[PDB]
Amino acid sequence: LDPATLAAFSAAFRGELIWPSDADYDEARRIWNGTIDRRPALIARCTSTPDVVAAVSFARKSGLLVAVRGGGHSMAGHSVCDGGIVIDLSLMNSIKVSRRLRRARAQGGCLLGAFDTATQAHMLATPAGMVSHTGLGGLVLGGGFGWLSRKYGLSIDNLTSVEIVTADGGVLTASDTENPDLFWAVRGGGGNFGVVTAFEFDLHRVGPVRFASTYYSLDEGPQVIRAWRDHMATAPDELTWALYLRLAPPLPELPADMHGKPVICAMSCWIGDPHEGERQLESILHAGKPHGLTKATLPYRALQAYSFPGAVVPDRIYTKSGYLNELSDEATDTVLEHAADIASPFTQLELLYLGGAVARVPDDATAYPNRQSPFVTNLAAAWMDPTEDARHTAWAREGYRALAGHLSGGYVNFMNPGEADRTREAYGAAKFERLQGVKAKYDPTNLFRLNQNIPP
Numbered sequence: 001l002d003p004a005t006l007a008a009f010s011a012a013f014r015g016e017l018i019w020p021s022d023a024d025y026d027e028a029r030r031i032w033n034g035t036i037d038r039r040p041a042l043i044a045r046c047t048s049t050p051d052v053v054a055a056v057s058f059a060r061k062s063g064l065l066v067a068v069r070g071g072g073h074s075m076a077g078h079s080v081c082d083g084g085i086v087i088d089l090s091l092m093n094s095i096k097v098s099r100r101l102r103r104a105r106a107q108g109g110c111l112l113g114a115f116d117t118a119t120q121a122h123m124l125a126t127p128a129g130m131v132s133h134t135g136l137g138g139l140v141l142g143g144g145f146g147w148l149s150r151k152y153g154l155s156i157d158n159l160t161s162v163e164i165v166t167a168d169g170g171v172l173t174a175s176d177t178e179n180p181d182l183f184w185a186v187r188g189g190g191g192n193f194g195v196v197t198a199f200e201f202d203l204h205r206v207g208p209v210r211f212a213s214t215y216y217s218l219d220e221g222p223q224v225i226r227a228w229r230d231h232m233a234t235a236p237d238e239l240t241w242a243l244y245l246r247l248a249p250p251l252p253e254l255p256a257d258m259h260g261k262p263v264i265c266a267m268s269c270w271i272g273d274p275h276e277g278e279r280q281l282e283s284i285l286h287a288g289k290p291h292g293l294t295k296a297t298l299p300y301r302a303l304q305a306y307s308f309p310g311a312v313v314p315d316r317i318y319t320k321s322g323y324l325n326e327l328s329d330e331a332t333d334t335v336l337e338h339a340a341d342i343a344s345p346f347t348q349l350e351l352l353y354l355g356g357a358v359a360r361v362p363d364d365a366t367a368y369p370n371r372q373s374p375f376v377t378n379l380a381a382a383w384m385d386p387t388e389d390a391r392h393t394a395w396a397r398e399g400y401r402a403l404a405g406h407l408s409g410g411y412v413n414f415m416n417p418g419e420a421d422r423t424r425e426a427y428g429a430a431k432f433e434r435l436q437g438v439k440a441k442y443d444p445t446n447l448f449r450l451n452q453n454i455p456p
């Protein structure tokens with residue numbers, strides 16, 4: 001490490017440096033995917049945009065492999081690197097909300113729960129992921145979907161501008177009117193094009209939400225999933241209905257003879273009038289007998305903080321996901337045969353219906369692929385014992401291969417560390433090559449390669 005560069009970076013960087021000798025280094029480098037044990041040479045905790053600029057320039061000059069960390073939830077483990085530098089944005093957590101203009105400006109290191117807390121102070125909101133502590137950074141740059149998406153689209157579908165630090169250390173504002181090629185690419189292209197230090201979103205009024213969660217016996221699985229698939233094909237935007245095949249959590253609402261056994265966990269909500277929501281959710285809650293039924297009228301920030309029942313954070317995860325255009329009866333059976341073999345109490349086989357507002361955005365308006373594929377299956381193995389990695393990974397892998405005949409594309413934010421190759425297939429040829437032209441203009445060095453990578 002050349003000293004003049006380091007020393008001038010020390011004079012510009014008004015944040016915290018964590019070195020491999022420091023006590024807090026083992027914790028600071030930990031990311032949510034515990035199977036990713038990497039030793040960065042240097043962890044930089046930025047507090048403002050000039051901090052990131054200094055961190056970007058110093059990494060460019062010094063030749064260090066760049067990681068960027070928002071909330072650290074990368075299923076591929078991109079946010080920590082072996083022997084490089086970590087531009088850590090976790091301290092840049094602030095949000096300014098205009099209730100009157102319905103505008104939220106959030107720093108690149110925000111967590112979802114912080115963002116939704118600030119907007120819900122004015123009963124405002126904009127779509128994002130379902131787990132409170134995942135980061136706004138990586139989620140939004142990949143698309144971002146959740147409870148508000150069928151009504152209001154992806155997270156990017158409400159983005160209006162970004163402040164971004166490009167590989168050359170320059171700071172650019174990208175929007176629909178300013179650097180619009182870059183705005184297209186960051187809306188689905190990940191961290192490939194620079195470090196976003198500020199997002200601006202349009203917001204929506206979201207009052208109380210009538211919500212429901214329940215569990216169905218697996219030997220009623222066929223009629224439940226079929227009812228689910230059949231209903232969502234024509235369901236109104238306001239109804240979001242998700243299925244999570246999993247081992248029943250040992251919760252008092254469920255009978256003890258169901259604890260630990262595979263079930264279907266159905267979570268449903270109605271974005272709109274709670275009285276219309278109660279009528280709507282009752283029309284979908286009885287495809288089979290609902291066990292452990294919880295129905296509530298929750299403020300939207302409570303809905304955001306609910307997932308997942310049991311409130312356990314796993315240490316180790318491996319995920320295989322893809323989209324479906326159709327969910328045949330044979331595919332439904334296949335899902336059920338593999339869900340019955342679930343081993344860890346923290347593993348889920350997620351089945352989501354997007355569509356709605358997501359699919360009414362034209363294919364080419366952003367960089368997010370597969371808007372016209374409604375279904376998402378996410379085989380999400382999650383466990384604690386690091387000596388058991390092979391048996392839980394094998395469940396995701398072998399379940400994915402049995403469904404390969406229905407699966408196409410892939411959400412970049414659900415990719416596991418060994419899926420660097422799925423990139424061209426996930427984006428498609430037209431989107432991949434346009435992304436490469438933005439990557440050629442803004443990061444021709446591929447300084448930012450710790451992501452679902454798009455080489456220039």
Ligand SMILES: Cc1cc2nc3c(=O)[nH]c(=O)nc-3n(C[C@H](O)[C@H](O)[C@H](O)COP(=O)(O)OP(=O)(O)OC[C@H]3O[C@@H](n4cnc5c(N)ncnc54)[C@H](O)[C@@H]3O)c2cc1C
Nearest residue numbers: 070071072073074079108129130135137138139145191196
């Ligand atoms: C428990 C859990 C639940 C999830 N639920 C959902 C969900 O409901 N819906 C959904 O759509 N996705 C979901 N995700 C996935 C989430 O969208 C991605 O994992 C996302 O990448 C997480 O971002 P992060 O910032 O926390 O991750 P990190 O690991 O920090 O980073 C992810 C990627 O984005 C880059 N990045 C992060 N911040 C920035 C920034 N400011 N500028 C540039 N690049 C940046 C990193 O370089 C990295 O390549 C979930 C993930 C987890 C772990």
